[PDB]
Amino acid sequence: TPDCVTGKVEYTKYNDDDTFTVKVGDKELFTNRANLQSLLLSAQITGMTVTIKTNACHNGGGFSEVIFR
Amino acid sequence: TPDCVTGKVEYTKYNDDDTFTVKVGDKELFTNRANLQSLLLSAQITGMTVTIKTNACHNGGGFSEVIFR
Amino acid sequence: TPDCVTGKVEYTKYNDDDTFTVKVGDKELFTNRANLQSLLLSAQITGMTVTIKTNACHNGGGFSEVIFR
Amino acid sequence: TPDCVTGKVEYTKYNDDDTFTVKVGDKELFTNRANLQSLLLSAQITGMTVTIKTNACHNGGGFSEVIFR
Amino acid sequence: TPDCVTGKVEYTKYNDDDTFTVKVGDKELFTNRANLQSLLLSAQITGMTVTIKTNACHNGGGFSEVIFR
């Protein structure tokens, strides 16, 4: 799966349908994997660099692969 | 969903019916989404700014959308 | 539900029947709500003030309402 | 249940059968309670003193009661 | 099970099939044990030394035993 965006997490958002949105760089992407919620919030809290990999690389696109650095 | 309140978490409360109350600004709101409990406690512990979005924007109102900054 | 005790957590204890004991002030109380286990350990780790509300306000009393400050 | 060992956690180990081993003092003990895994890792990360209570107080013994201080 | 690699976690990766990859030393290994995801991310965040034990000691090998130091 191609890299879509790499950077620090600007904000995260818990959505009404229980998906989780993350803003990295200039993209706002969402995931429906519940396990990723606290992992992404910890990446945000500790200033990690995340690389989100997704084919839906556009605002509102979904993802399920993340590298935490 | 309209923004209801933005600020640092003043306190959180685990309720008898397993819902979770959060006080931000001047509003005391609650959520019944279990996944939000440790996310909101981490936001409190690390001094994050949260924006709670809800139509029930009054004390005792329920919510399910939160932005963590 | 009346306030029972307010203070910093002195210690927590995982019990054999999977309940969780917390000592605050001079009271040793327990809860059977699994969700409260890591929330109370985080309150302990970060020096939060907790207020336990319970009618069973005596050693060995059970509780399910907590304010984290 | 008698106290078996008190001290800081020297290391923890995730085992193939999903049990979790902890070394405190001179004893290597294990637990099969999934809830204790992240609680014990947090106790290790923050230098807490833990008291493991168990009748099987010997290397390889199992436990389910822990005091976190 | 033989030791495969010991060192600090260079990065972790959440995979599309919900397995979790970790890079330690020169090996990239994965686990399918969901419980290990946040334990390994905490080990990464706090600079722990981990020893991964596995017979599949090669890139892309799977593991289920980890010592956290």
UniProtKB/Swiss-Prot annotation, chains A, B, C, D, E:
One of its GO terms (molecular function) is toxin activity. It is found in: Secreted. Disulfide bonds join 4-57. Keywords: Disulfide bond, Modulation of host virulence by virus, Secreted, Signal, Toxin, Viral exotoxin, Virulence. The keyword Transmembrane does not apply. Its main location: secreted. Belongs to the stxB family. This is Shiga-like toxin 1 subunit B. It comes from Bacteriophage H30. The gene is stxB.
